[model samples]
Target chain A: QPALLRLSDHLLANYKKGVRPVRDWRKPTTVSIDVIMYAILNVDEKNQVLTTYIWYRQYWTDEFLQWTPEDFDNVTKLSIPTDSIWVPDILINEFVDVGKSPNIPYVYVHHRGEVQNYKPLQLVTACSLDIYNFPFDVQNCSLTFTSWLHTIQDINITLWRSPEEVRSDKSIFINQGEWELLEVFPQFKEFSIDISNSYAEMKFYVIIRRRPLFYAVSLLLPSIFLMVVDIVGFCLPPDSGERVSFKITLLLGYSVFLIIVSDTLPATAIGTPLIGVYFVVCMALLVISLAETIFIVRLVHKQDLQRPVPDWLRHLVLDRIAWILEVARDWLRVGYVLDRLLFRIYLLAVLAYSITLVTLWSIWHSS
Target chain B: TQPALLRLSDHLLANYKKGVRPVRDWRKPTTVSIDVIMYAILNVDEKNQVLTTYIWYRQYWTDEFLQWTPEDFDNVTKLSIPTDSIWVPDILINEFVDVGKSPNIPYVYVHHRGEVQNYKPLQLVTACSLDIYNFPFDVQNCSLTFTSWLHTIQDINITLWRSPEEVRSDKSIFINQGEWELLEVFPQFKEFSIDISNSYAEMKFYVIIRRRPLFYAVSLLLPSIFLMVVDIVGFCLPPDSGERVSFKITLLLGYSVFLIIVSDTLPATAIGTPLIGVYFVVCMALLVISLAETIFIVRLVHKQDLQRPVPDWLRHLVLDRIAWILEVARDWLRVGYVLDRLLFRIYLLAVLAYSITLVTLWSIWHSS
Candidate 1:
């Protein structure tokens, strides 16, 4: 009888108000435990806050212990003795001052037995360490902790403090919490936590606060403009040496700048940069074009040296291609209505082809 | 006429002999001038001697009248009239001796009644200066100098002295005599007269010398071996994961070392090295081989997963050709017998076809 009483006193003596440290004296006889809680904040049409339990799991050493909402309500009355125990806190409040923002209406947590006065705990205010103040104002909140404890013979707890605010959004909430768990995570592991709801609504609400259609469109428009410029270079007469040099320079310079932009990104094999791949492909084409220039110069020099074109057999096979290219080049340089029309058609085709190929490649790579 | 005569007198006076200084007599228009004797040691073979023609020409400048052989032979009469007339000493002797190995060969220039000995003027027994003796043996020989009278320039006499034993081969006699006229005695452009006869004969004579044939051969041969080694790596099994990795590592490692060597020789250009061109060709081949390996592995893994022999469709398409290739590869690996038996026959056909194509392409590129 004395020994039982002595053990009870020892177990009760080390229990604290806040989170328990992992290295407490009672831990040796206590069962190792893990607890995870996931909550979602849903705002109704009337701007009322609703907190939903996305996931809750707890483990006692190697075995899993399951519980329902009723179990949480009657926690103190439950007969089962746990070596370690943890419960997730899900608190929602109205009449909280968030900001003038239309999408995100921030909320704050009130301390136990301190709701009636309407005088909020300074630490649980809109800017604090409290979880409820996350993704918005955080300075008014106090510390929030998750902990574990042991059973009849011994008790121990481990705590993790939450950061100021962790921003999240609707996609993360819908995809990661509900879909990813149902699809991917459950297939791999027995127990998993989805802490999506705690900050998802606030972040998503902030995102749709303003229309982003204009900014999004503006970001992609310059890339299209650069493609058009490149197509213009191809349409220019091949004989125009300055035009060739200028086009090559512009393309190469743009590629170098784009490469610099890519260096800032994380290296990944999954998704290659679309612009970088496009640059390489275009550079290959440009190299071929330069080779064509060399070919033409060589032909001209050869003709100069030989005085006249070679025999019929050689001329039919080789010189004919040069002749056709020369004619096409001259026609492109002519300043007439036909020339302008042909030039426009050629540019339109080049532009369409480059844009289509790059768009297709980007889509494929992204997938 | 007087200025010309004065100029002639000044030239003669400047060339007067070292031990025979002339007396100045401005009052007398016709004065009997004392004869001055000159001796010069000519270096016939300039290759064996360190002789400076500029210093030799300066020795002739003195304050006495002098005349040369051509002037003495042309003028037959002896007369003394003008105070500033110039004439050379008349007697000339050219002594020949073999100086190839002997140092004390006698040489003299007899002038007036004075005998100029080779050892007296320079106070040396050897032909070359003792202070600058560079070769194994002393190079001394007999030599001569010509002189003429300033007044009686006609009837210049010649004297000859020969050593009892010749110091050099007589084959070099004509070249030795030609050395006197070939001297460029001008101070600004001093030149050595080459003995052409000796020079031609010496140039034809072979001298044993070390050559760096091995260095050049190794430089060319080692790179060829390395290139062939890289080429042979193509025959290695491209399927074995470990072997593939090692082969790729070896190929790229060789390439990297080769790149450093090539870079040392070539300036960086957008245009690649010939070796780089070869590398690119080989690399493309390797890439195709790698792709083929990947495809094969994928198929093999798929078949294994399915718990079946390789599919009939794959066997009909890729596997049949691959089996033939494997057999050939086996044959290639067993070089001694297989090469003698069947490999050479196939190799000959392939080589002929490849050579024809290569020749055609070479001609096309050459034409271009």
Candidate 2:
């Protein structure tokens, strides 16, 4: 029995490495193969291996296919990967190999191996592959293939393949009876490959893609919503001072959010982020609003000083012009015509004159 | 009314023209001239035309000037020009001409056709010309030619021109009287030729120049003084809410001064006054100061909040590090550094940051 088991081990190892030569010793010219995977549990006290589960279903109609089930059953008890009731020691080895191929250049894998009776044996394989040529003999497919073990029910058997292999193969069985032909290759695909006997088994899978959707949503949405709220706040009456408080609250909220956002990101003095820009602009607006509020409040309280004849003239000339434009904007929605016209004609004139004076003054001051 | 009166009128007009011309005679080449211009007052009651008053002076030597006594003036009546008791119109005719070589010029004197009366005409030529060629040719060597009036009492000259005329060949007596000329024919040696009259006359000399000094002082100094006052006011404590009140009052005072300065200038929109620019800069500074004051006050009031630790490490890092900077800045004056390096660095950073921000903000605002 030891000699037969040694021979089977040798054949299995050679088969896995794709080094086994094809043979013609079978009675019929046709060949059938059945693959099963299992996750076996052990009870140490029982001290006896049990054929607790069968995972494959027989569906062959041809005579050659009919012999495959009989062969699986005959070897089922002997093919159990564990000898004792003790569970196999599974160890996962994860690494990234860079020097693999030209286009399919990197392989990242979690190679799970087990030791049974002090002999090294592979139990499960979790890997990611960059396959450049996958289907129809393409020069470059540039695929990242991933899969993983899903469940370990005692009576069930399943098979998993790399995403690229799934695309190339014509038929593959997923569970006891489920089968699918290769349809289309997705940008990211995942599957599980299982190898098992009636009593014990191993499984391997890969993870092809990782989505950071929540991290992005968490980092971005709150501040975006806050900015939207602030923009909406512009419709509020400037004199009410409510907008001031609202803006202040929004600024505080954004600052708190920034504290959180900054934590997740690396510290940088490089160009600020869009969200940071929004935060600063909002802060500036809030500060301006606060100052404006105070000014208006003070002016309202001290009407006498604010309404002096000269002050009245200032209001008439400058403030009133702004007020008139504001009114026109509110009533007629003049699309900035008043502002443009007045600013171009009068304000620019005043500004040019002011600049001239300021330049003269600066020259004098420096001199 | 008759042809004869018309002839007299023509003669009067001619004399007036000649009076304006320079008095030129080679024999009596007077270098000094006196011009007596007056808004004449006519005496209608007297048949003889009375020149009531004129601003007249004698350009005589200041030394040896006469102080006449009654005895010295006893022959004053005989020394006067001959005329009727009312000073018959012969003197008028003598000073006028029907026609002259210079048609617009009047004659020195003209004789009357009528017989003369007993009284002599008192020719009061208070103004005079001095011919300096006879003496040292210096301005002081000049002597005025004058005639005394028929009066025992001395008449006083009330008007005098305290200026000198240049000596020039071919120059008439009145030619260099009122004109400006180079005293020595040098470009830099310029003087005005003046005339004197012995009657008080009023004249005005007007000039216009830029009022930049006043404008600058008013614009720059007044606002600076007001800002300094605000700084001083910040030092006054009220015991309760002293800082608060001081800041508020300081801000208000700044605003008030700003408004006052704004009002005093030509409406700021009309011209760019230096003062207005100064006012704007000062106002911007006050705004920044106000913001800083608010931040300091709030921090001071909420010092307890500084001690509260946040749960997250990120929060802890920000709260501790950034807050420490703010807190240290607040107490920097109190906490003496080893060499006060921290304080100086912080102050410089703050000023640079603040100025940059201010410039940016102002640039955007003004550009808009």
Candidate 3:
């Protein structure tokens, strides 16, 4: 329960809502703004939308509403209804939806004619989200504030706080989603539709990066483990006739896991994520290795096709590759030696691919 | 870019009717289109089998009596009037077990075309049968049915404002609950007939959600699989080694204690047993079975040097026939060789098959 004050009513007695409160209409009205990022409610990659809660403050001077503090019971400030004054019509250019703000009935009117309107706003804005590095990607979204109808002569927008100060506002920032806010950078600009028609704008750039440990544990770790299981299957005796079944099941399991990867990954139509490419290549490697196992299984079954080896094949494999591989003996030893050689190559391919992917992600993350 | 409003409510209310359905003819049923957008999953109470969610619920219907020409109302295309001054259908959730809590927005907007739109934020607590058969990787389908409690199909007809694609496509507005991710939302229209005169039309939205199993896997699945691997590798130890049985016993006890630590994390329900729980039981059964085999093998090894001649029936069946089939070397007819090469091989195959089968089955279920 609060008592109603009479100061606000007196100020609005003869105030005109349509015109600017400045004495000289030719001069530009200075309107400065500051925003505190309260919370990130949702970040939709596919739709390229960001829903955020922010405490927005706008400060401007009203020449008509000025009064002496010593005159009216030493009242320095009065909470007046925003509708009673000519408030600046600052709008977010990227906004896709209307601002879902609760009814904040009043703005503070100081004796010096300065009016400060502070309220929490839930803004759903459209942004072009680039997820090329995905999970490890850093997103920079711009929230541009400008007047829809008021040009540069009527209103001039400016930043109230520096980027460094806004970036350190960590105590009030509530982020429960996958992203972590890194910095808030501000840029001021002027746009001209014609030689005389110009508009002043203040863009607050929100830089946020993904915390990728959740994705790594859920997706990458399991994928690596499956690959390791496939590598371990190579140790089983190929003559046992069970190795083929083992590799087949491993390949199928790996294939099934791809569905989970697709299910969990962010769905975007534009740039493909590097992880998806890695997954596809890994699947290809698994398929190639599975085919090799089947091929070896077939060769083992037809071991008694004791035909004479070709001179070119023998010279290329046994004389050159076998010497390099250090095969002590020979004859259908080609199959055994070649099997060992292929295993090393398979292992190396996996290691090289994994290492390259990790290095690339780190490089992208750092830059 | 558009002009704002005017106060035209007083003039419209002078001739408004609040008690009757907004239709010119009595035979024409009032058509109400409902739209729901999920805001947040507040909580999922597994013990009580209740799901609490916050949503943006909107209903649109044409109020033929509340129409006004914009030219006669100072270009006012819409009027915000008190909901109590209009006839709004009482929509109730059929599955709701708890009271619906909502914000105190008493106003509904009326367009110049006589269309009325009521939008409000509603927190719903409803009863849903949660199946934990797949545990952490489970997908849950829950229903929220909206129907007028008193009005039958003849008085009012309910329909979905947005298609399934339209509803799910605008996922930008939805807030994730961290533990679960929304997969799909689709609506189904149904007519329930309690009696010939008591039939009702209902619009239901089925929300399909998937559990993010990373935390559960880190806490439960990883350790359990590690223990299973340890059990598999235990076969590498010599059967005659005195520490084999003791080592296995220690593992069994350790696994039992591990299960105790994780039991509270899983939901206790009789509706259906979780696959992970069955896998645990199978792992324990194999552990005991391994222990029994080790004891039997140890007994035979200890009795191998008794100098008693082999029994004719036993030698004929195992040593002569079975050994020949298995391609066992003639030089190694010892009991330890028979136990290790013959019995152990079959045991390993069975254990490997069991593990592979369970994993494959789980993957199959997941893909489905």
Candidate 4:
């Protein structure tokens, strides 16, 4: 025992820092790694941060570790101390600073020149996201792994673990927040021909669909209900001017609510979400309705100033077109025949539009 | 000399697992304090998706962390080493999810120097959820939080190196606030405690700021009044030609386009809708009112051929009893001109009272 301690003391004392751990840097070195995803903590729309929990294993061969078993008295399954060796850098574009058990010091070199490192990490990566569908949307996010300083020629990155393992992990997948995991696909990304600066990159994509029930109740259904309120404005008397105020007040409520609901959806430039378009359409319809009432009130108040229904208008509006569309009435209105005809037609048209719009958009909802 | 070298090497090897704590007592842990100064807010791109800043992040370490005495290094006070020679704390901001750090580890570091400073420019691509409720009147807060990635809270604790005080003195960078004005800046420090799942806490620099309303008011409100004035003037135009209705539509179109432009400037969110935007929408309702009035007036002119008679309910109320409420009339005041003058006088009186009341009410609500 004394002799063995003396020999090891010399080895530790004389081991130089400059010597390479492996024979060559030229040959391509393959490092096999396996990762287990525990959960996705947070995903943001405007800022694009994805927080996640990941556990992984790394395995490689050391050039200088091989020797005759007789020299060291056939020691096996020995764990190396944490401060004693070099650890590989497995970094993705989105990186974790320090995660679970950054290094496993010792490994069993059961065969010549082999060791392994397994670690757990929690990191946030900036992910570019598409948020057009907003509350009723799904997202497919990717987390890539690669080497920074080490080129593709020096270190090759690859993965291990069965497809069935992913299934087991999926069953136990933890989601404490707004995203649910649809699938966890681990793949390798091959990039760049520059060869000099290009790195060996491995990518892992996490397909996470949003839990939209929160915003659907909070934003979507409320907007549709606001549209219904605009329809109620049609029930008000045309000439009373109360209809104008009724619709006017409702219009403000709806507009303000549109802005309020907009707070949840991501503000975007290129494409306005379908719901936003629908919001504006309803708003315009109310404005147009309110405007039509302005004339009704004026005509009802200024009865003497009202013009005779011209022969051309009588033929086009009350006679021919009304008959053609089967607009049932006294072929027109009471004292305010023209006003009533215009209001009824306008109301139905807006109503029909709202129905078709909701049906189409709900059927083909996508981000 | 050989014996001394052997003894010193033995001491080093024996204490390898003891790590860098100078006292050799495992009972107490080490605490590290850090400080940061923000230089500039380079870009806050909502559409392009890059929220960036350049900050000088500094870490300080004393002789205890270097794990060596002056005597062990031939009395040299300072030294430089390769990037990977010793463990450097991998401190990351949890808030900034993705960072495109300059990959080349600058192989220069000072050991045994006063306050081991790790000052580097980090380009962080972070997501900022800018709540634009008040918009032109809103205040914003952004922060830089750095926590040790691997070190346990028991092994190391992070504190402020100096304080948030330095950044306040040097608010030199363009906030790129666009239509907004920077109102206030505050920096706070706190422990980011998650001591169970991870053995690390963080020090954060919270930046608080408010807005300036001058630009947005000039851009958004001024045009709004101009459009309203044009609307009232259209009411006064002669009802002879088709010019009035056509002109009103043109003006309304212009106003509608303005609404689109202003809304486009900010990211669309139900929560981020501006109070200013609500006003522009109100303008849209007003335009439609104008259209309805013009169309009604045109149809009224058509009543000329019908020879409609004024109802006694309206004529007796107006043209009856020589209008007992009036006191002022000139010798040249003819019958037709008398009613016109009365209408003018009432309109002028009402406008004067309204403006006076409006300003007073506006003041009462805005002030404490």
Candidate 5:
């Protein structure tokens, strides 16, 4: 026990905190970094920020603090104050907030000069989210770790946990909600302002995808059902005196539904979601249906007994139009025949619109 | 005074070994009484099923070698000694899933009567089995069991310094958790036997808490009910009024948007889905079926003017059997119109029965 106290007192007697723990100043000290995710506390989609709790570890060699295990009562490990040691300035390039963690002020020093410092850190970093497919979107947010002041010659950084290990070990990655982690990959790169020197960095990309069940049930299914309702509205008898008003009411309600759902979408100025475009097209189609209904109602409610039928109008409506539609030309009426013709055309237009949008969304998700 | 205090400490610790228990008789076990006061709930990770809490932990025990005559030390009845110089129980929490964060308090208080007191604060993270089936209205009881890691009951006997009522009465230091309310705190002392002859002394503390569900009710429940009410009233619209189907479809879409907007506020669990979610799905299913019925009635009404011959089998199934059951007029057109009202009443009854059943189940689950 006394030897343990003596070791600490002797180690920091003449140690300089600012100097690197190497005999030669020309040589660089290598710091190996390891991180394990503990929890994902919060993900703010609106602000494009992520908060994660992680266990971070750094290991490096301190040449000046070396000792023999047999020298002082066979002491093998000592807990030394970190303030008396030189620590590498490893900075996260995407970090945007102050790191909060428990105050752990000591590091473990082995007899062979190996130093290990492990602590928990709550990291708040920026992630520019691509929410175009949102709710079904996958995001890749990168975290770049580099030295703040040291050049590549002064201090070197290396990865202790490989990307494959991080991806395979599901026990180490704990997430509380919403997202499923897909992959993690690391890249080592060098950055330089000119050709004189370069700075080294290690970047990690965290790819995650959202669980779409909740949003699918709440947003997509309902919108599709409404579109189907509009399509089926063509089946309502045109001369029933309620068809135009029914289509009009459907349009108004659909617009209101769109307005409410738009509030839930991720607000951004750069890109619009495919679902947003789908809603717009649905609105336009409803309007076109209303206009068609009005046109059909005008023809059906025509006063043909009191007014004379022009020869050009009779020839164009009864003979020419009926010929194409295969309606009996013997007893001619324009409105009833046109109603059947337009309904088929409207059905075809809506089917094309819905299928095209769905295909495009499916393609985006696949890629 | 300082010299005498130093002399006493040196003499007591001269042959004292921190590894051995400081009992005068080797056959007798050491008694450690512990007291815990909760400070705050740091975090409740529902997804990970972990509870992080801040607490004040204290232990008191008698050390035979630590006792000294106060007159010899000039009335130095109590002394502050480094904790490393004395023996401590290797107490551990059984449910701990992560390392505890304790403050660097290096000293313990030693009294002339041989009583030693060690007090410190700890941030403990422990695994808990959470039943979020009731979700916002749910109550949870998470247990924390404290015991020695390597010491058997014969080597070290554990006891609690405070009773359950005493811990409950001490609320001055307890901090309020954001979404949960402290309901009750209870302690139990029991021996956990690994086998017949070997057992460990344990003190388990149960923390009972209830969720404050006002936020969930406001965000999820009220809006769902509002949408349902709108659909129920749609049945009042005459079947001939082409707006009935349109109104019901609009309500359905609105409910869907409502679900999407507020689902972010709800949490998912691996054990079971929340009852409120099932309630939502059933409501959606009801809306869909109602819409289908409306469209079916509209189709029949349209067929009335076409003079299309009704198949013998379908006409017998509807006019003969269904009309007899519903006591409707024998006319096909009237059957279509009257079936709308009949279907509306059945829909209304089904919704009421479902809602009542859901509420009863919720109340029962909450109490249990």
Candidate 6:
């Protein structure tokens, strides 16, 4: 114990809060920071929060703290409390939410007398979200790091490697149901405005894409099928009421899903997510489909209070407008032609609108 | 600018960067408190899917942004300044969804100056999901969910600036006009805990409203019901008048026009069918039957003699049994024909009963 205490005496340095080991206050200290990411805790999109574990090794020359290895028994490394050294004011502008050193107290001194400050940061940066394709969409967000208080002449920032090389599987891949990592780019931007001071900024960009198949199978596919059934239910005599009941039942089913995804749909008053418009067009067609059934049952029902079949009726429905569509229907009982043609026309029209929506949405946003 | 204002500006620049607030117990565990007050509801658009509300609220910056204590000056109760010198809190609506948020930006204006006073004009263009199942008579319950985009509970705390009773009232602070009547306002508290993030509490301002439906009742609801009743009475009408098919065709014509009008007022929101929309649909489905019977009646009136006459199997079985069910004197000789009556009332009763059941069940599901 006495030998250890004697050894400690030789390796002594003043370690106290607000005390700097660098004796000359005018001479600036140079610290090289190498960030070792132990874990990428999580990224919150809705809140724009990032929690990460990083051990940043900042190197500097402390002129006042020096010793000869021979006298100190080859004790080249030493331990000291963090408050003894001067730290650069290199803060994350986005480093925040908490505004103070409240997240971590993990500061320590290291080999060759270097200062390393380790922290688990909970910072929030602004992300302009575009959920146009929603669960099927991709998001790219960047976390920027720069010197907050010091200017370029005082501090310099650099990348340890190429932006693509720094992704060392340090990220914990959760939120798989919501988003998956696409790529990460770590780079530095040098801003030399030729003003009072210049700056070097480090940026880490995270790219992620959403998983949408869960909603597509569970919600969308069923709605499409039921809508198709609504059109097909026309086979059951319109008066049978089964078609209308089928429509109402499915409409109720569809409403709940619409509410759930309301967060993702594009927010345009004049513009709509055209993809859903095709999707929604199929939905809107239900209204016109509802309207068509009444006329349909009357025009073709085998029985009606008969006089001469009214000419206006013939012109209103039974004329070439009716006959033109009937040519396609060798599969039906006599008299009803418009419904079959309405089916084909709307089918083609929906097909055309659907293609237009697909083409339009794909042409715009991918990244 | 006066020397006082210039001196005040310098004071602000120094104080703004200082970044610390005093605490009575500096050693105690601190939690940031954010006080939110909703002052008025401005507008709600059912079609464009946006709700606008205003709140005269202040954020309680726990450690750094507090004001002068009671002992600072003799009459120094508070502090106020032109809002320009301070940064505005970027409060966001979490459940926002709208298309024109770009061109249709939310607006705010506040520049008043005083002593230790803090308020900003906050106009939120929050988007909400609309349920049209009960549209026309539909009560849209939308939320203006307020949450901090960047601030967390570690530094900031949230509180209600006004009492619950003051917020939830029909005649609240703002005046409404032209379209809808104010129904009620309710407050809901929310906490979003996600991923590795801390709990983010959100304040949800529920603006419940009711739009008028007289146009719907007259055009979509009443006309369809009247037309359905007309078809029902057509069954009792002398089948001799071939007007059943003619009147039915003409009815179809006018119904189409009215249907077009109905479509104009409503949205094609790809989710639920309105009660009124389907109310017309399922009921009129019965109109086909009424038309069919008229055609049958015409056949009965002007027809061909059948060599086989009525089959004995049907004649002996349902014909006699129907006699008791009909129990009417058949044209000077009592021939009861009950078969026709069953077709007329069978599912119509079922549909009416089902409509009632649907309303009761759906209403419970959507709100209760």
- The C-alpha TM-scores of every prediction are 0.23, 0.23, 0.57, 0.50, 0.50, 0.44
Which lDDT tens digits does candidate 5 get at residues B245-350?
7777877777777767756656655455546666667778777877777776676665455455545776666666465445112254554555665666666776
Q: Which ranges in model 2 have alpha carbons more than 4 Å from their true place?
A: A6-221, A232-237, A240-246, A264-367, B1-368
Deviation of model 3 at A195, angstroms: 30
Backbone clashes in model 3, listed as residue pairs: none
Flag the better candidate by lDDT, 1 or 3.
Answer: 3
**Pairwise TM-score winner, candidates 4 and 6:** 4
Residue pair clashes in candidate 5 = none
Residue B86 C-alpha lDDT in model 3? 73
Residues A1-367 of candidate 5: C-alpha lDDT, one tens digit per residue: 5998998888888564444566644567888776666666666554456776667788989888899878798988999877667677676765544347676999999999989888887876556666667667777877777764456776788877776786555577676677776666677888785786567788777767776778788887887788777767767644335777777677657655664666556543234465665666666566655655555444344434233446787677667565756222222355555555656665665676567557755754674
lDDT of 3 by residue, B1-368 (tens): 01223234555666778887878778767889999888656566767888877677899998888767888655556345656777888999988987543443565767789998887667789898787666666677988999888889888889978776797655655654245667877788899888998788998889887765543543554455545544544444323333467656766775676666556555546554545656667677777776665665556444455454556675555666455437122222354445445544654665576567557645754663
DockQ of 6: 0.01
Model 5 spans > 4 angstroms off: A1-99, A102-367, B1-14, B41-50, B70-74, B77-85, B101-106, B168-170, B238-241, B261-264, B270-274, B299-339, B354-368
Per-model TM-score of chain B: 0.26, 0.28, 0.76, 0.66, 0.81, 0.66
lDDT of 2 by residue, B58-101 (tens): 22111111112323322111011111111211112112112211
Model 6, residue B119: distance off in Å is: 22
Cα shift from native, residue A224, model 2 (Å)? 4.9
- For model 6, what is the alpha-carbon lDDT of residue A311? 58
lDDT of 5: 0.67
Q: Kindly list the per-residue Cα lDDT of model 2 for residues A186-290, writing each as its tens digit.
A: 232112343631221222222122122353367435645554555455455354346445543554344334433433321111122223333344434444443
DockQ, per model, reads 0.00, 0.00, 0.05, 0.02, 0.02, 0.01
Candidate 6 chain B: minimum summed lDDT over ten consecutive residues — where? B101-110
TM-score of candidate 5 relative to the true fold: 0.50
Query: Of the pair 1 and 6, which is ahead by lDDT?
Result: 6
RMSD for all candidates, in order, please. 48.3, 54.1, 10.5, 15.6, 16.0, 16.5
Off by more than 4 A, model 4: A1-20, A24-26, A65-84, A94-114, A162-168, A195-198, A232-242, A304-367, B1-121, B124-368
